[PDB]
Amino acid sequence: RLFDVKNEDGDVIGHALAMEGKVMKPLHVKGTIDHPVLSKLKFTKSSAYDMEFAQLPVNMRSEAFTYTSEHPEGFYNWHHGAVQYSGGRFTIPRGVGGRGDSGRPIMDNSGRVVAIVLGGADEGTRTALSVVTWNSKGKTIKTTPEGTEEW
């Protein structure tokens, strides 16, 4: 599920995630996804969304995250604490995101993913994130951004 993408030393610039049959990965994260098989797949770009993706190895699937378009107002969860659903805007405090986080999912409590981060724009006291999400009438993927700094 959880996978890292490194640079030169081998530095984590971002993250790749195995979900709903595929491997998602934010394009701008120029690097190699660290996995002797994943790093060998044919990935396709969607630039209108900043995603890159390969079809899951026909067994890896099994351990894939699940997605969900149900996104109430509330708190969600991410590797560095709580995520607020501040009326259509996913937020995080100010001072918490940056290099390393592009790629990381945001889940609910049920353990399903709600969105994958790409960057953030600090509005005041919080950072509203650049989020690619999907809603209900198919996977209708969605890049939501503020006057953002991709990270």
From Swiss-Prot:
Region annotated Dimerization of the capsid protein, chain positions: 72-82, 108-112
Top-level taxon: Viruses
- Motif span (Nuclear export signal)? 33-43
Record site feature (Involved in dimerization of the capsid protein), residues: 76, 109
Q: Which residues form the active site?
A: 28, 50, 102
Peptidase S3 domain location, by residue? 1-151
| UniProt-reported outcome of changing residue 102 to C | 40% reduction in autocatalytic cleavage by capsid protein. No infectious virus is produced
Annotated segments matching region Interaction with spike glycoprotein E2: 44-49, 136-140
Spell out the subcellular localization from the entry: Virion; Host cytoplasm; Host cell membrane; Host nucleus
**Subunit (UniProt):** Homomultimer. Interacts with host karyopherin KPNA4; this interaction allows the nuclear import of the viral capsid protein. Interacts with spike glycoprotein E2. Interacts with host IRAK1; the interaction leads to inhibition of IRAK1-dependent signaling.
For domains, the record's comment is: The very N-terminus also plays a role in the particle assembly process. The N-terminus also contains a nuclear localization signal and a supra nuclear export signal (supraNES), which is an unusually strong NES that mediates host CRM1 binding in the absence of RanGTP and thus can bind CRM1, not only in the nucleus, but also in the cytoplasm. The C-terminus functions as a protease during translation to cleave itself from the translating structural polyprotein.
Function recorded in the entry: Forms an icosahedral capsid with a T=4 symmetry composed of 240 copies of the capsid protein surrounded by a lipid membrane through which penetrate 80 spikes composed of trimers of E1-E2 heterodimers. The capsid protein binds to the viral RNA genome at a site adjacent to a ribosome binding site for viral genome translation following genome release. Possesses a protease activity that results in its autocatalytic cleavage from the nascent structural protein.
What name does UniProt use for this protein? Capsid protein
Q: Which organism is it from?
A: Sindbis virus (SINV)
Instruction: Quote the range of the complete protein represented.
Output: 114 to 264 of 1245
